Amino acid sequence: GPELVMRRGEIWQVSLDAARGAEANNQRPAVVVSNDRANATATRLGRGVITVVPVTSNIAKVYPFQVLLSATTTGLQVDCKAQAEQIRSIATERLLRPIGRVSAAELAQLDEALKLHLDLW
Amino acid sequence: ELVMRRGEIWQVSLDAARGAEANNQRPAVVVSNDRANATATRLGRGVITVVPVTSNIAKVYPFQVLLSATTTGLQVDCKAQAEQIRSIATERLLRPIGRVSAAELAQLDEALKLHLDLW
């Protein structure tokens, strides 16, 4: 049917609202990193969570578990960096608006960053 | 005392969750690497990534891992939900519970690889 369509690697603005401590809070872009079967399921079941990697414009010092996302490739306003150490499963109701998608190269390094952060090698 | 290491089970406070997100307080498995974890211990504050656990084991998906009560410190058999993975502030940690077995941790690694499309 007309279920929400959503693909790994897409950049969506999401509402993380009420967070504690150093958690990414408020509103920010985030990269979808859950696989696409789960992504379709979370919209047909409508009882769904998807997993995303939040993004910040405070680039500063970049760590090997973070990926630089260029404003030109992604449709973002400014350059940003995906923080694999902020990975979070979100209810689909936190999805606000699609912004774009990362490049294949960016997504591949994001996989590397996730494997480094979660020790999955 | 934030001395959490990978594979350990901690009671975490998942307040302010929305929708189908794991909520309330519950056990969770630390899955962030131990160098990040040790950084958090050393500074006394940080973020750690956990896999929330539910006692509802009515059905087990391939991205979920049944954890046995007999070895983990959990009162009953539970399941770890890779699709609920979540980076939490250290202030959400209430207390330590126990530790998954090595086999359970490796199974959780496979479930995380499946859920996140990491091959």
Structural domain of B25 = 1-119
Spatial CA neighbour of A4 closest among A74, A95, A103: A95
State the Cα–Cα distance between residues B49 and A110, nearest whole angstrom: 16
Resolution to 1 decimal place, in Å: 2.3
State the Cα–Cα distance between residues A110 and B8, nearest whole angstrom: 26
Name residue A52's amino acid.
V
State the Cα–Cα distance between residues A81 and A71, nearest whole angstrom: 10
State the Cα–Cα distance between residues B91 and B43, nearest whole angstrom: 13
**Cβ–Cβ below 8 Å for A22 and B46:** yes
**Cβ–Cβ below 8 Å for A21 and B118:** no
Name residue A41's amino acid.
T
Query: Cα-flanking dihedrals φ and ψ of residue B95, to 5°?
Result: -165, 155
Q: Obtained via which technique?
A: X-ray
Residue of B nearest to A31 (CA): B116
State the Cα–Cα distance between residues B14 and B70, nearest whole angstrom: 25
CB atoms within 10 A of CB A7: 11
State the Cα–Cα distance between residues B59 and B66, nearest whole angstrom: 10
Which of A20, A51, A116 is nearest residue B89 as measured by Cβ atoms? A20
Spatial CA neighbour of B8 closest among B75, B95, B118: B95
| Structure-block tokens of residue A24 | 């990414």
Query: Do residues A110 and A32 lie in contact, with contact meaning Cβ atoms separated by under 8 Å?
Result: no
- State the pairing for strand pair B78-81/B64-67: antiparallel
End-to-end C-alpha distance for chain B, whole angstroms: 35
The number of folded domains in chain B is 1
State the Cα–Cα distance between residues A70 and A48, nearest whole angstrom: 30
Residue of A nearest to B36 (CA): A117
CB-based contact (8 Å) between B116 and chain A?
yes
CB atoms within 10 A of CB B66: 12
Helix axis angle for B102-116 and A104-118, nearest 10°, is 170
Which of A23, A47, A91 is nearest residue B89 as measured by Cβ atoms? A23
- For chain B, give the number of residues: 119
Helix (H) or strand (E) holding A9: none
Which neighbouring-strand residues pair with A23? Answer: none
| Structure-block tokens of residue B35 | 């160098």
State the Cα–Cα distance between residues A47 and A59, nearest whole angstrom: 34
Alpha helices in B9-101, H assignment, sequence order: 34-43, 69-72
